[PDB]
Symmetry: none
Subunit: 71 residues, 6 copies
């Protein structure tokens, strides 16, 4: 008996933002005028911000491999 299985395989994930091109983003003009507003609860505001924000709770890998030879 000759037992010579070969694994050359690939298992791949490419997830999120990959290989994107952003050429001169936000070259324009933003004007905000606010006089006398009242806010009674939470405010989240972004004006002209252009941040890059990444969250990756994923992307984990398992390899499990079992060999048994019983004579």
């Amino acid at each position: 008996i000759v037992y010579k299985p070969v694994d050359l395989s690939k298992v791949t994930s490419k997830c999120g933002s990959l290989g994107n091109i952003h050429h001169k983003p936000g070259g324009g003009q933003v004007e905000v005028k606010s006089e006398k507003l009242d806010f009674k609860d939470r405010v989240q505001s972004k004006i002209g911000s252009l941040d890059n924000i990444t969250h990756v709770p994923g992307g984990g890998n398992k390899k499990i491999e079992t060999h048994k030879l019983t004579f």
Copy 2:
């Protein structure tokens, strides 16, 4: 007995935003005038913001492999 299976396979996921081109996005003009608004509850606001935001809780890989030879 000769046992010689060969695995050259590929398993691939490409998920989200891959290989996109954004050329001069947001080259225009944004004007916001707000006098005397009143807000009783949460406000979330974006003006000309243009952020890149990526969340990936996915993209995890499992390989499970098992071999037995019984004689």
Copy 3:
């Protein structure tokens, strides 16, 4: 018996923000005038920020390998 299996395989995750190009981002103009606003709860505000922020609670690897020969 000859038992000579071969594994040359790859298990790979590419998750988050990879190989992106940002060329002259935020070259434009942001003006904010805010006179006499009132805030009774939490404010979070970003103006022209352009931050890079990464959270990676993921990306963990397990390899489990088992061998037994019983005679």
Copy 4:
């Protein structure tokens, strides 16, 4: 003779107001205008009050346990 009984039991009372959620109660508007009323006997009045009041004359526990071995 082997006398090995086992009690892992639970006797539980959950009585009154438990695990309730009250989100922004009384967020509205109450106006009371009274000009020239006359009251010849006891007045008890609540306007917009929103109190929490708890009376617990109950909720007591009794355990009685008795063993006898007679030979």
Copy 5:
């Protein structure tokens, strides 16, 4: 002789107001106008009150257990 009874039981009372959600109750408007009323006897009055009131004279637990071995 082997005497090994097992009690894993649960006896539970859940009485009153449990696990309720009240979301923005009393968010509206109440107006009371009273010019020249006359009251000859006791007045009890609630306007927009929204109180939480709990009375629990109940909710008591009694466990009685008895063992005897006679030989």
Copy 6:
């Protein structure tokens, strides 16, 4: 003779006001205008009060345990 009974049981009362959430109670508006009222007996009045009051004449525990071995 082996006499080895086991009690790991629980007797529990949870009575009154437990694990409740009150989020922003009484965030609204209360106005009381009273010109020239007359009161000839006791007045008890609450306006916008929002009190927490607890009375616990209950909640007592009694445990009685008895053993005898007679030979």
